[PDB]
Each structure stands twice: as C-alpha cells, then as structure tokens.
Amino acid sequence: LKDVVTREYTINLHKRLHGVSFKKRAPRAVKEIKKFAKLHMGTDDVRLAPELNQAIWKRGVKGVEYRLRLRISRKRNEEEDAKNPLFSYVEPVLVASAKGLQTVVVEED
Template identity: 70%
Template sequence: MGTSDVRLDPVLNKELWKRGIKGIPYRIRVRISRKRNDEKDAKEKLFSYVQAVNVASPKGLETTVVEADA
C-alpha cells in the first residue's frame, strides 16, 4: 500500500485469537485501506488500516482491487 504506518482493527485481533493459541486460522479474509492521518505530528499523511471481513469460507477467494469513489 506504500505506507510504513499499518494499524490493525481490534476486531481483527479478536478474530485471530478467538479459538486460542493452538487454533489460529490458516486463512482469513482482510480488507486493507489507506486512510488520511489527521494527527498533528504525523510523519506520513496516509496510513494503512487492516480489518477482518466476514465470509462463509475464505477458501478459493482471489484478490480484488476496489477503487474508491471520491
């Protein structure tokens, strides 16, 4: 995504660890989006935000690029 600042959604963290340390899922569908950094002392003006996406089965899914309408 071209940013060195990557932030994880707390829901993603819960999704990864919900089955415990021995039950980590092999595949999980995530959405990565670039967002504007509104902090006052930010080094970069953009950051990447990673969040979990609910799907029935992540098996067989391919990468899709979605362009945002601005």
C-alpha cells in the same frame, strides 16, 4: 497512482506461522498481518481493527486460521499526523470460507 485505495486480500497465515512456537502463534499472526499490509500498500504505519484482533485470537493463542480475508484501506493520516502522510487500516471480512478468493479492489462509493 491513487494514494487512498481499499482492497480485499486473503492472507495465507498457515505458511507464515509454520513451525512457530505455540505461545506466540497469534502474536506472530498480528506481526505477519502488519508486514503483509506494509508489503501491499507501502505504508510503515499499520493499524488493525480490534475486531480483526478478535478474529486472530478466536481459537486462542495457538489456533490461528490458515487463511484470513482482510480488507486493507490505505488512507490519509490526520489528527496531528505522525511522520508518514499515509497509513493502512486493516479490518476483517466476514466470509463463511476464506478459500478460493482473489485480490479485488473495493469501490468506496
């Protein structure tokens, strides 16, 4: 299919961080997002925008949001590439509410 594609996802961080230790809720949220992007785009290489990291840690280490709207852009690895030819780039989506949104495909052009 189209190796380079970008989509809109909402991730239920509530169930993924359910029961997780308080001091590692936000670091676990980072790892769950990387796992999420790996599952959806099939890329081992996942890179999170610092503004997405800021979104994760907005309410501190213990107060990750239940749902988070993400824009995942699978692209072509360049600049003296690593092993993989493709990588996923995750950046946050500014929405007043991250609820009641479906996975959609973003047109680059």
